[PDB]
């Protein structure tokens, strides 16, 4: 409804007024409920140099239910699968209307930096993350080269 639209416009403006400087997000075209985002691979992570695209769909009762967020760029990560689905608490059970797209993107950035052990969406990548970090990093760097450059 009108309340959701007002809140989405405010967040769009929040992002413009205080640009995050490694992420961006906004409407695809003229549809305020469907956004795109980009996250730069964090420096000192195996994703460094990559640019990762996301899609965001806001529900009509936003901000009281979470947006749906998925990657469109392929990535080697324990908590993000080949469909681009993201296992992240705040997108499910831990959503609050105090959260914003800006905070979601920062949380996803932090997730890239430090995966969650309890949530293996891709069990084999989770396993290599836990057992052979140097191998995980090598492969995550190779996938950044292959998909995110």
From Swiss-Prot:
SUPFAM superfamilies: UBC-like
Record-level Gene Ontology MF annotations: ATP binding; ubiquitin conjugating enzyme activity; ubiquitin protein ligase activity; ubiquitin-protein transferase activity
EC nos: 2.3.2.23, 2.3.2.24
Catalytically driven reaction(s): S-ubiquitinyl-[E1 ubiquitin-activating enzyme]-L-cysteine + [E2 ubiquitin-conjugating enzyme]-L-cysteine = [E1 ubiquitin-activating enzyme]-L-cysteine + S-ubiquitinyl-[E2 ubiquitin-conjugating enzyme]-L-cysteine; S-ubiquitinyl-[E1 ubiquitin-activating enzyme]-L-cysteine + [acceptor protein]-L-lysine = [E1 ubiquitin-activating enzyme]-L-cysteine + N(6)-monoubiquitinyl-[acceptor protein]-L-lysine
Impact noted for substituting residue 87 to A: Catalytically inactive. Loss of ability to promote FBXW2-mediated GCM1 ubiquitination. Inhibition of TNF-alpha-induced degradation of NFKBIA
Alphabetical keyword list: ATP-binding, Nucleotide-binding, Transferase, Ubl conjugation pathway
Mutation effect (residue 65 to A/E): Strongly reduced interaction with CNTO4
GO cellular component: cytosol; extracellular exosome; nucleoplasm; nucleus; protein-containing complex
Class of the enzyme per the UniProt entry, highest EC level: transferase
Location of the UBC core domain: 3-149
Signal sequence range: none
Top-level taxon of origin: Eukaryota
Single biological process term from Gene Ontology: protein ubiquitination
UniProt key word Electron transport: no
Disulphide-bridged cysteine pairs: none
Active site annotation, chain numbering: 87 (glycyl thioester intermediate)
Record's function text: Accepts ubiquitin from the E1 complex and catalyzes its covalent attachment to other proteins. Catalyzes 'Lys-48'-linked polyubiquitination. Mediates the selective degradation of short-lived and abnormal proteins. Functions in the E6/E6-AP-induced ubiquitination of p53/TP53. Mediates ubiquitination of PEX5 and SQSTM1 and autoubiquitination of STUB1 and TRAF6.
Family that this chain belongs to: Belongs to the ubiquitin-conjugating enzyme family.
Quaternary structure (record): Interacts with SCF (SKP1-CUL1-F-box protein) E3 ubiquitin ligase complex. Interacts with CNOT4 (via RING domain). Interacts with E3 ubiquitin-protein ligases CBLC, PJA1 and PJA2. Interacts with PDZRN3. Interacts with PPP1R11. Interacts with E3 ubiquitin-protein ligase PHF7; the interaction inhibits cleavage of PHF7 and promotes association of the complex with the nucleosome core particle.
Descriptive protein name: Ubiquitin-conjugating enzyme E2 D2
Source organism of the structure: Homo sapiens (Human)
Lineage: Eukaryota, Metazoa, Chordata, Craniata, Vertebrata
Protein's gene: UBE2D2
């Amino acid at each position: 409804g009108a309340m959701a639209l007002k809140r989405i416009h405010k967040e769009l403006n929040d992002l413009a007024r205080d640009p995050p400087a490694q992420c961006s997000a906004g409407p695809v075209g003229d549809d305020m409920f469907h956004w795109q985002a980009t996250i730069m691979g964090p420096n000192d992570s195996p994703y460094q140099g990559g640019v990762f695209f996301l899609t965001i769909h806001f529900p009509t009762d936003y901000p009281f239910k979470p947006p749906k967020v998925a990657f469109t760029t392929r990535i080697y990560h324990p908590n993000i699968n080949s469909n681009g689905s993201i296992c992240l608490d705040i997108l499910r059970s831990q959503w609050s209307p105090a959260l914003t797209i800006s905070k979601v993107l920062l949380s996803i950035c932090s997730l890239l930096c430090d995966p969650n052990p309890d949530d293996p969406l891709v069990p084999e990548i989770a396993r290599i993350y836990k057992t052979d970090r140097e191998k995980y990093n090598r492969i995550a760097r190779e996938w950044t080269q292959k998909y995110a450059m």
